[PDB]
């Protein structure tokens, strides 16, 4: 069923809450035993959001290999993503260790450091060229190279240095700065424009490790980003684009991380973004 017609059907009947609850009911449940060990309590931002054991990212260190992050591997679309929580004061060094070990090119950030008067993630990158950051626990140095501030997003060039080997890499930071404190955007135009800028940079492409994407918990805005991308890519690839079923794609992605798409308003926005974005994929 063409999603655009499905969309008007749900909208006129006002059943978004009922659709969303069906998804929550049918979603996978796998163990997350490592996340729940007592030695990891200060590595989790929220008690109710954990990576499944089968899909978690492992840090390459013998001490403690745990980080709240998951590998979402989309086999038909041929895309992979790492979804993670906003880093905590005690995990900023683990976060950049993961970026290094997984060979990522880009970091995608969908929240502000402070929202609703409260801190949603640590200030984990440097704000001035001449004031670099050193992560002593993981032996990394991070320097701000340049910054381009636009009306709806900021793109930063960063240099990450492995202090053990003195290798350096360029990391691109894509920061969407205008998601509202409550609710979802009224139009998907600026979110789609952001997604295409990430794509154009090479950060989503198979010559690099998976992109790292995060918000505060790493499941809501982050889920919207990867669901819209994968759905638009499948519409590009298939003979019949109307065969793409966003609810089935979302359930496949929830085999790899719990809770993706947090509200019925986020589900509706995901539909809207894919519908409007297809009016470029089909050729515009």
Is 106 marked as binding a ligand?
Answer: no
Secondary element (H or E) of residue 264: helix 264-281
Other CB atoms within 10 Å distance of the CB of residue 151: 8
d(CA 267, CA 218): 16
The reply to whether 9 sits in an annotated binding site is no
- Is 32 annotated for ligand binding? no
Q: How far is CA 243 from the centre of its chain?
A: 25
CA-CA distance, 145 to 128, in Å (whole number)? 9
Show which residues are catalytic.
215
Which residue is listed with tokens 């009224």? 186
DSSP alpha helix (H) spans, 175-263: 189-200, 221-237, 246-253
Q: How many domains does the chain have?
A: 1
Backbone angles phi, psi at 109, to 5 degrees: -120, 125
Residue 82 DSSP symbol: E
Contact (Cβ atoms closer than 8 angstroms) between residue 8 and residue 30:
no
CA pair distance 212, 232, nearest whole angstrom: 19
Q: What are phi and psi of 168, to 5 degrees?
A: -130, 150
Q: Tell me whether residue 262 is annotated as binding.
A: yes
Alpha-carbon distance of 198 to 185, in angstroms, equals 19
| Of residues 25, 28, 104, the one with CA closest to residue 69 | 104
d(CA 138, CA 251): 35
Tell me: is residue 181 an annotated ligand-binding position: yes
Are 220 and 45 in contact, with CB atoms under 8 Å apart? no
Residue 144, strand partner residues: 158
The span from the CA of 268 to the CA of 15, in Å, is 11
Q: Which of 146, 111, 152, 151 lies closest to 128, judged by CA?
A: 146
Resolution to 1 decimal place, in Å: 1.8
**Full residue range of the structural domain in which residue 121 is found:** 1-284
Q: Is 221 annotated for ligand binding?
A: yes
Q: Annotation-wise, does 19 bind a ligand?
A: no
Helix or strand run (H / E) with residue 161: strand 153-162
Backbone angles phi and psi of 174, in degrees to 5: -105, 110
Q: Which two tokens stand for residue 14?
A: 């006002």
C-alpha dihedral sign at 129, 169, 87, 199: positive
């Amino acid at each position: 069923m063409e999603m655009e017609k499905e969309f008007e059907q749900i909208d006129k009947s006002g059943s978004w809450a009922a659709i969303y609850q069906d998804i929550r009911h049918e979603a996978s449940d796998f163990p997350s035993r490592v996340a729940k060990l007592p030695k990891n309590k200060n590595r989790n931002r929220y008690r109710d959001v954990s990576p499944f054991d089968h899909s978690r990212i492992k840090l390459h260190q013998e001490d403690n290999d745990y980080i709240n992050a998951s590998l979402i591997k989309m086999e038909e679309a041929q895309r992979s993503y790492i979804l993670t929580q906003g880093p905590l004061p005690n995990t900023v060094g683990h976060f950049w260790e993961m970026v290094w070990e997984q060979k990522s090119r880009g970091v995608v950030m969908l929240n502000r450091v402070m929202e609703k008067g409260s801190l949603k993630c640590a200030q984990y990158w440097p704000q001035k060229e001449e004031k670099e950051m050193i992560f002593e626990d993981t032996n990394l140095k991070l320097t701000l190279i340049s910054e381009d501030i636009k009306s709806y997003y900021t793109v930063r060039q960063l240099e990450l240095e492995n202090l053990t080997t003195q290798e350096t890499r360029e990391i691109l930071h894509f920061h969407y700065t205008t998601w509202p404190d409550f609710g979802v955007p009224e139009s998907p135009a600026s979110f789609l424009n952001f997604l295409f800028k990430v794509r154009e940079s090479g950060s989503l492409s198979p010559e690099h490790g998976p992109v790292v994407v995060h918000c505060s918990a790493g499941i809501g805005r982050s889920g919207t980003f990867c669901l819209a991308d994968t759905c638009l890519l499948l519409m590009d690839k298939r003979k019949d684009p109307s065969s793409v079923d966003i609810k089935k794609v979302l359930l496949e992605m929830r085999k790899f991380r719990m809770g993706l798409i947090q509200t019925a308003d986020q589900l509706r926005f995901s539909y809207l973004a894919v519908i409007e974005g297809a009016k470029f994929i089909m050729g515009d």
